[PDB]
Amino acid sequence: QQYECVAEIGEGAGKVFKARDLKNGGRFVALKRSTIREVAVLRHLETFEHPNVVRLFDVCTKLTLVFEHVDQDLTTYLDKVPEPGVPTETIKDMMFQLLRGLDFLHSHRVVHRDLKPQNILVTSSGQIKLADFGLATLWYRAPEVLLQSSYATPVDLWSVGCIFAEMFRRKPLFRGSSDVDQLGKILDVIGLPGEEDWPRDVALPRQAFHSKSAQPIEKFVTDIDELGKDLLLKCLTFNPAKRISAYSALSHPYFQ
Numbered sequence: 001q002q003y004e005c006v007a008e009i010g011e012g013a014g015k016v017f018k019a020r021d022l023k024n025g026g027r028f029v030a031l032k033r034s035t036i037r038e039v040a041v042l043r044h045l046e047t048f049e050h051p052n053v054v055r056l057f058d059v060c061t062k063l064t065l066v067f068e069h070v071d072q073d074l075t076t077y078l079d080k081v082p083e084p085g086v087p088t089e090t091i092k093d094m095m096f097q098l099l100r101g102l103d104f105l106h107s108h109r110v111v112h113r114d115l116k117p118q119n120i121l122v123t124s125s126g127q128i129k130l131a132d133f134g135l136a137t138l139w140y141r142a143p144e145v146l147l148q149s150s151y152a153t154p155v156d157l158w159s160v161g162c163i164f165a166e167m168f169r170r171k172p173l174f175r176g177s178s179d180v181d182q183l184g185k186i187l188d189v190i191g192l193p194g195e196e197d198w199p200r201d202v203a204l205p206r207q208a209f210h211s212k213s214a215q216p217i218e219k220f221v222t223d224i225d226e227l228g229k230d231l232l233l234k235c236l237t238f239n240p241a242k243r244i245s246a247y248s249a250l251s252h253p254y255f256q
């Protein structure tokens, strides 16, 4: 064949294979098995070669997508990082890149929808690359998706908040086990929202939760400076309309 399989890196989405690219120097790639539209969109994004998204190298034809392989993801990086964890400035750098990648996507009307440490890739030189977007665990899901009310771009900024926190904590902020658990565990930290921030005509009303009050976020994210707290909270806003965008996030003072 033109590629040659070696491992599974691996499962979702659903399988991702590490493969030898025989034609191009035996380098490692990642092979992946409205369609030709999503594919078309993916090729159009490639034309911009944004440095914070995985490169698409080839499309073969049922459907095999050939992407850039990177040795680790954020999960494995947070695993192996020595105590006392990710340096403050490294967290700040990795966040900027994350939001850069995301804004690039959002600005080209692509919503990721499943951001998590497992498809945030971390290059040996420390470059952040987003993977596993543009094709078709609730700990990273936004409220509006749990509630099944809206699926616009803000959905991904909620996931960014969760990741930001986890870069400090080295463990997830919201480890729910069901949509309803997840929603519960979220409001336990951020508090019950105003009645007019609660989506209209969804199955779950505000009154299905008695998660009294907002607890100060630094109790859960020890290490976090004042500015990170501000940013993190603007990301973890209940109302998608009031949530900060990737674009505004790029200008937040936290990144001065």
Ligand SMILES: O=C(c1ccc[nH]1)c1nc2ccccc2[nH]1
Pocket (backbone or CB within 6 Å): 009, 010, 016, 030, 054, 067, 068, 069, 070, 071, 072, 073, 076, 118, 119, 121, 131, 132
């Ligand atoms: O290179 C990767 C990829 C994913 C999607 C497209 N490329 C990739 N490298 C990985 C390393 C560890 C865990 C997951 C990984 N996933």
